[PDB]
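Checklist before submission:
- one chain only
- standard amino acids only
- sequence pasted in full

Submission:
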Amino acid sequence: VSCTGSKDCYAPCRKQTGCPYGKCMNRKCKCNRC
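Returned file contents:
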């Protein structure tokens, strides 16, 4: 699932994980596992 409501989540993680994907669900963020 792709999110777009935070203070730069997928970013700080994308650096670590990579791919633009993420496991962020609900008001509970959680980048993906690339």
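Reviewer check: The helical segments are 10-16.
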